[model samples]
Target: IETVPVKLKPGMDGPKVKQWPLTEEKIKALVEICTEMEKEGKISKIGPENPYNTPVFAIKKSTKWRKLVDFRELNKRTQDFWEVQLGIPHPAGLKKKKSVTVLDVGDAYFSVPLDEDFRKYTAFTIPSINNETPGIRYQYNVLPQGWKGSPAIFQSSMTKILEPFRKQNPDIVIYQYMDDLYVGSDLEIGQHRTKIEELRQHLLRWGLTYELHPDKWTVQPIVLPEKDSWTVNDIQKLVGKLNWASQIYPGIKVRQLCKLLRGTKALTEVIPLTEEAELELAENREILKEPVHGVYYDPSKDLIAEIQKQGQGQWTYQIYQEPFKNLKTGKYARHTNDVKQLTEAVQKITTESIVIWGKTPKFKLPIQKETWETWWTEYWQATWIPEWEFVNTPPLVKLWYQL
Candidate 1:
């Protein structure tokens, strides 16, 4: 069934799967299944369907059941998709004859003093008390914990304040996540320095201090005042920034990384390897030896029937008929070039653009390289074999037996 194809029959009304009811009985049953699955070291719950019709499932623990449901509801409501935030400017977004400007806001640390005082004072504009010894000591019983929305509020506020300037000046591209700002231009790098300096000054005026380094800031062709060669990590970072660019800066070697990032766990094993890579893979061969559970080269009828049983015949057919290409063997030319480096570049941008541009972004916090790689590995390692064998599946179809 994994290798079987679903044929589209003309004029046939498709499958109809029943939706689960939201009730105490259903909830309790779900909770029971979760407990049983946990006790038996197996999975009982199934994956939620996407807005489109693809059905996927995972082995989930009881503790994670509620969170998984919350995630599904959030996705359905938000309709968000995953996209990588490049922290760079789009070519079309840049203006002619302007220099590329960059803003790097480093990570935020817990504001210990502010947090301590916050626990003592409930509001930001509270009155400063007159010096009273023991009575004036900060109270902390009712305050919220740190990390509760500080970063979002900070990021949203800055973006909102800077929104007008961005609209007025088309040449500037201001990118921010929390305190990080990245500005870029197509003209001379020096030409856009004043605006950034002005913004920096504004931050300072607002009681915000940045960890700015003069030597670390620059435009396109980031130059060094002194004649020093770029460090290895520097070169790597530069490559990462420009690899697979459509127009602005070209010849970056980032696509290979992107392609490797997207490769299925099973396909990676098939990747032709150099001796060193082979040795590394071989050492871990025991772990990587198993084949992916289901082959997706062709349509899966069992999946179709499962979806039809779960969703409905019409919806099931609709899901299978859609033009989602197989990632392993779809368009070759479009993804393979620049040492198959272009694949990574296109994948990074294409996949990210889909996530960002979608009506709902699956995740908002830009996914990091580590997360992406780990997810890819997990994707490859996933097994779809049902936990319980259906040889004597019951409550639906029962067999007669002599006691």
Candidate 2:
């Protein structure tokens, strides 16, 4: 929605990489898409540009060829953006809603224009269209996908654009995750529809277009291999989609699937699926197909959590209400499984005000600092002494006194 500029870190923009070779069919596809993007003012041809001729490649997705700019070299020179904290809706927030609607922005990145000055940093070269014709160089006029900071920029802008709407309709619970908006309301169906219409008008005023009118969402299918054997690229694609599915529905835990992802190292190495991977894949598909019921997340109620070892070296984080019914949880262990994922699970869990029940949980998350400090004091009580002081030889000590 805004002309966002990328700030590069202090360094020479790395050496330009040559574009990857393309077949005749691929060249035709690239030319077609580039022409469309150029017509839409998303990209424009560049002549004799310096410092940023990144390579571009195409991969077939279903039937259409998708163009992807290899920004790996340019990204090295790009500075890190300060991350923004967007609190999650937790699915618990959608309790007892009369009507629920989902809205998404079409061409999320294209909607965001790039600053004229910073466009040079996104230049990419497309291979020759024919045997003799030379390759062409083009730079993005809008925020390009696959850039490291684009998501942060787009998300922050969306949050800002929706600020007024959020304040005006406090009764509606708006869960915004980047381009997708999940809306839940206790209002009547027609009123809820009208409320979303108002939201759409607000977005249109800011020059943003909605992909879906008021009600639409996808239950992502877990894409399995058509062939018995697959490559690293295949697994990566599978993992990427499933990870996305997990983010959309926190209920679909990615703990097991993440392990399978870690196993793939090479892009084209042929491999076979593990038993766990097959089981987890089908399990998630079935889970996604089930009907969803909401349990209200009341902060005023007593919420206690327990973290402990589960079967096969995995750890479980379970949230319970009162004398204890599970509200939600995850299967991740600190030491054995992915520690970062474990910390993430704990971070989200501890975001809410909940007590650590039974045993002390010392995870390396934001909310665990005070808990750790408390542990230090409790472990070293006033009556505490060194183990050396309890040795049998130490009993020889005596005190001299005069009567």
Candidate 3:
């Protein structure tokens, strides 16, 4: 068991909290889980009189109910040190891989022990068997979910645990994002299999590897019913679902349509859909099934085009320009002064500088000849004004002129 210190938000006091009323089934489930943890030395019962407390709630997962704390207030008073540095490889890089294996570290957060004194901050009121009676309270000895800094602490520990293997095998690339680990290699099957076995053994020795189902990446087209048919809750749920789904799926148009409705508030608070919005939502569902042809436009140019055929084929374009006008007269400026030569010169020098006295010939002016045979007057004055005050050295002035 390794302990991690908790960093609370500055100037915030411990919050007082209340527990949700629990049913007999929920109370029994909570008691069983807490007792099991205590047997495993994962949690300890505090005195009947507790100082700091947070609320507790139960959520159903698969066959059993999992007891969790309402750490909202505590979380608000805690600091966030978690930084997301995990990156997914581009689709091109992923296509070259022969095998992809995902490993899950179950109950990952609980593996790190919590600081004894800081653990009191996680205290929550336990539910009793009888609905009316108050029960004993407990705090986790190990890091628990719902704490704001748990992920960063777990990440720090996990990185420390895996650092040795990373140095030992430089050829194999291992990527970890929270509890999920992705193992990649370029070696042949016979060579790669051994590498996989070595990693498996190392993780097992630390008892971090566990059984779990991997999440799927497929995106399905979700079509909502007409505005009048769905409730505020239904619309709100759909908006949230689509918003999250956008991260995995390339369906920004569909997500944009869902955003048209102000939010999932009561009928009055919800924005009534315009005819155009309704049509776009229906059209968005259809386009999601087809290849995604995301459109991109260049701000500097007038051409707008569609990115198509999975980025392979035919090119199509559109050009748009608003008529130029003279601001002073409020009249069309059909004929404008051309600065093509001056524009070209500015573009070239800004992109790549040329020493005036170098082998390369100096740029010829389109409209020639200096008025007073004093071309270097402005150049010498500009360079000397700033350098004259700072450097006091006369030696660098000639070098500055050449530059």
Candidate 4:
């Protein structure tokens, strides 16, 4: 039909309604604008390099996998960049110039599902609280509860809201992942207050508030009731992710991860742990090695076959019997068909992977020297010049802003 803009009276409090019959050209423009906004970054910028900013190329390429690729002989040909280009103020030692403070906003509640079955009265319950009362008890699904996209969604919203503060405070950097925020800076009373005020204003403007307030937000440097100003519980409460995938980790790998729990008390000594601190660490570790299964050509298929023959079609403990015996022998049984078979079987059974799958073939090992060099270069850059250093700056408003 025709496009007509809505006209609002000068004093009208209500929104003006546009005519429904809009032009196809206007609709196309509207759709294009939305698509642009939702792309990887619309309002955000690949912030330029500064003391608070690391080179985007350096930080982006230095993530773990990329860093690993750079860990080869490339270092031999190229001079070390971190030392030459980026000065390492203190290369070997770890030191902090100021006290560290963390400000966190936990998940509130989720919105009711848009499904037909959802009712108006049944909204999601907020996640964290100073105390859980009997009145607030029930199965509630807030906006954060079951949404797959909750973290990034909430984080982006929070990031945009806090950008003004971040931009103004070069020293103070705010990290928003889900509702939790790690707002850190060199610890000073002024710095602490600046961060807290900014946070308070933010929550007020958004019609939001935390359950734990002046008590939870601290410049004393303590998140928990402890001797020191810093506490691990304070850190973990706002700074970790879940690890629900640990159950599928290889049995042996899981054992190694559990070994970390044995050192918990010592960990607390360095930093105070919340009552459930150990649980947090365990869950995080499990997430790292979550089982992802794959099959590869087992080079040791012949060995598995030999073992099957020896054990009457059963892959058993006996496969290692000869290898154990050979260790004592002068000539390690690098000998018969049976020896090769047993070794192959052991490898396949233990790893649940086959030798045929090894990336390098037994005969023609394709060592892409150039690939390795590129990989190694990237790895070295990341290892020495972590993205953390670039993104992990203390808040600036705290130290400098004095109005």
Candidate 5:
């Protein structure tokens, strides 16, 4: 519905149902921004027919207030554009590089200009808290957040702008995931500046502002507590850190801790670190500190073959073999061959009864006159076969494989 008027369906109300209570600081911040953006022609006043009002809230420890719209309803009806697939470079690859840097396009979506016809669809209302301009409804002139097509539009624009940098780079490998661009290379310290300059020049030429935010780019090392003094939020942060490190360090302790973290809920919940958990945490830390090697996994067939060939030889002492021999000694030397013969015999018995007789084959003995279930239960243990061939017998055989 491009440029088409939209009206609420029957039994529908306006979108101005919820508004966040703004603090004095938040009120001051919101008013100052709205007034400035209005004067700069980035936003304009709209009438009540627009009907859409999104909630706005203050950012913690910051002077900025965010305009948050519940766009789920609009998104369901809006036309969707193609979004770029994100490919983050592995940390393992970065560890080998001498230099790596992340470049983010600040005010990401707002940097692109919005089409005049489509601007009305982005209308929102901000209520006056401290009596600043008596609550005005406005629409964005530039692309704003909470729109379905915003990311796709911005990313497509950025890709076009940064297309030049793609051909010139063997020194710096640049990867862009939406507005977050990562620049990395294996070159020495002095070699990176040329590509950095090249990126800046392209940004300048395209009239797009490119700057790095340390808060967004820096990877802070998480230091977990020593004792059992962790609240739910702290445990959450710890769990998140462990999960983030999961790809780097794969271990049983990490998996267990992740599961424990997932079950945790509520901010007031406390996690008490047990001695075992503490030792596991230390072991995990040591594991992370050590250099990692490439992972290799033995397939199931390889493991099965190894088990068959190395059965007796795999044991350290002959005493273990004597007990196994007395338990069940097969006439055949190869365990796999014995298992194969048993499997074939079981399959033949099942096939013959199922296809020919359409039931269980009757035994010649008079004692087997009882039903299959009753006879099997009474005689299975009495006629137990301890041969290696029977070790991996299929579950189907257990039904009527008595003697």
Candidate 6:
């Protein structure tokens, strides 16, 4: 397949939009990015011959300026490709995966080019930024970002390209999600490194490059803010990292941690969290520090796949092992819900005897039988209660009380 370019079907509506206003600094960055893209053949200096023109702008990201093309109009015109799907995680043997890597492709969309004829429809006018000079137009040579169909095209292309690699290195479980690759191996650490290295060479041979992980946290260290407020980004980081741990230990829940992110839509906005959130975070931090089972999937134990609501529109359909082994005693560690369910079966009557020993008349209450009435018949000749007390048993002694 020769650089499988996007052969977009012609659209009915033709829309052309002017570029967004940008500051001098952003214009410089955009110009620099354009020049670089030209050098890399991602975009070329072309004439304004196309009917469809999408607006493009620069956005300030965490690292630097990103050239974002506003392909909203273009997207509307093109037929939607629902075939472009999302990703998922592994099954039971996840704990065995000792080594893992998450690799992101640089300018993944640009990896696929647009057809020569279609490039005309992809044209966008670049503003003069500050000058009186008119804006000149240019079109994308590659499948530009923000285009609806680009993901389908790019994902399709990558799947095909990585098939051979997957076949060659069957030991290394490679989960390819769009531009990102999650390469995991249960094999020796040395073998994992070698396999990943082989993968890099394979990708490079195909002109595909991998972006190095920014944090370099193989040891997986994390920092948390105490007392001080959070930027939406901070909680996001915490949740993301917690998810990594949750991947290892499925029981470590973050449903509450995720709730803190509700009001904080603006990422960089400074905000404080409630006591409930802070307490949950404190517990999660302790759990993170403590030694936990790498894989909690005990075959001997009762395992259940429960769907817990993590956030709005976010449901965690994950596996959970029940009646967990408690180190303290033979007594099993159970969820609050599980305990409630157990009590609900006999909720009408006391699970244990309500008879109090010694002269604690205040604590003595008639316990209800499971099937019939009170413990009056059972304790009728009881040595604990005085003869007068039993004869004058008032209605006040009906409910539970303590001395």
Q: Per-residue CA lDDT of candidate 3, range 221-304, in tens?
A: 333445565545555655654454344336444444555556345743545565665666666556544432443222222211
For model 3, state the Cα shift of residue 349 in Å: 51
RMSD of each: 24.5, 22.6, 28.3, 29.1, 27.7, 26.3
Is candidate 1 or 6 superior in TM-score?
6
lDDT per residue for candidate 2 within 139-193, as digits (tens), equals 9888776554465567767778889998998777765432345577877667888
Compared to the true structure, candidate 5 yields what TM-score?
A: 0.41
* Residue runs of model 6 more than 4 Å from their true location after superposition: 1-18, 39-41, 46-51, 59-66, 70-100, 106-113, 145-151, 154-160, 171-178, 184-194, 210-403
Instruction: Flag regions of model 5 displaced more than 4 Å.
Output: 1-17, 57-100, 106-121, 130-134, 145-148, 177-179, 210-403
In candidate 5, position 165 carries an lDDT of 81
lDDT value, residue 331 of candidate 5: 16
* 2 against 4, candidate with superior TM-score: 2
Estimate candidate 3's alpha-carbon lDDT, on a 0 to 1 scale: 0.47
Computed on alpha carbons, the lDDT of every model, listed in order, comes to 0.28, 0.54, 0.47, 0.28, 0.44, 0.49
State the lDDT of candidate 5 residue by residue for 64-124, as single tens digits: 3543444434443452232223212222233234555655453566656777766666666
Error of 4 at 237 (Å): 38
Compute each candidate's TM-score over C-alphas: 0.24, 0.40, 0.43, 0.23, 0.41, 0.42
**lDDT digits (tens) for residues 1-403 of candidate 1:** 0111112123432222222223333344445544553354322222222111111222232333220111222112221111121122233332222343434332221221223222212111111223222111112122112212223324444555577677867766655422234455453444556677766665554444612122332221211122134333333333333331212222223443333333335421333323542343233333222322232323222111011111111111011111221111111122211213322322322222212221111111112434442232122211111111112122211111000
Q: How many backbone clashes does candidate 1 have?
A: 31
Error of 1 at 336 (Å): 20
For model 6, what is the alpha-carbon lDDT of residue 222?
Answer: 27
Better of 3 and 4 by TM-score: 3
Show where candidate 3 strays beyond 4 Å: 15-17, 48-51, 55-73, 83-111, 146-148, 164-200, 209-403
* Alpha-carbon shift of residue 193 in model 6 (angstroms): 5.5
Worst 10 residues of 4 by lDDT: 324-333
lDDT tens string, model 4, 225-335?
Answer: 223433444333223212222222222122322333443453333454443544544554443333223322232332211112222232222111222111000001222
